[PDB]
Symmetry: C3
Subunit: 82 residues, 3 copies
């Protein structure tokens, strides 16, 4: 239960960070390009996003393991019920 | 249960809206810039995305509260079982 | 249970693909535009993203049906408990 709520937090944060990147990209095309500061912010948000993606992949793996274990536990209590 | 399925709907809609922004940004660079209509659509989708992000943050908070309450309820039925 | 973990996988993959598009768009503005290869990669990732979005919409519908059924089942075992 905690793993899924946690994973949803991970995804939400990722899309918020990605929205910031989108804004910077929109700014970039409006301005016909961006200076070093523009590149700095792009880099900063990119770093944040990759960390969130990495953490989400890790959490995804743990959630699937828990699912597999729960599924197996339930399928045993299925056969034993006959 | 409903809170998580609901939150997944929120996130999905957000990424769909963000995909539209991405397309507009791709169009923008291909065209070497965009007119007022391009800016209008960017603005419209940005508004949609921020509303979805806000709603998702709110839903996230409610899901975590429910988790905390459920966790506490379960941990009490843990101690009482001895 | 599987439907939500599965849907989280769908969303994660979508945001990863969308991150690749973002990078290409950033590259595009830095370079003042992109060649045919740039357009090819944009197209490829766009295709991936739309397939993931489609699959996520489908999974969302199934999750909501399961929720509706579970909710109904629980509300019947509510009335019958009096």
């Amino acid at each position: 239960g905690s793993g899924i709520v946690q994973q949803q937090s991970n995804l939400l944060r990722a899309i918020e960070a990605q929205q910031h990147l989108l804004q910077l990209t929109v700014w970039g095309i409006k301005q016909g390009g961006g200076g070093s500061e523009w590149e700095r912010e792009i880099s900063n948000y990119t770093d944040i996003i990759y960390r969130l993606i990495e953490e989400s992949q890790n959490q995804q793996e743990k959630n699937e393991q828990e699912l597999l274990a729960l599924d197996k536990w339930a399928s045993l209590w299925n056969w034993f019920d006959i």
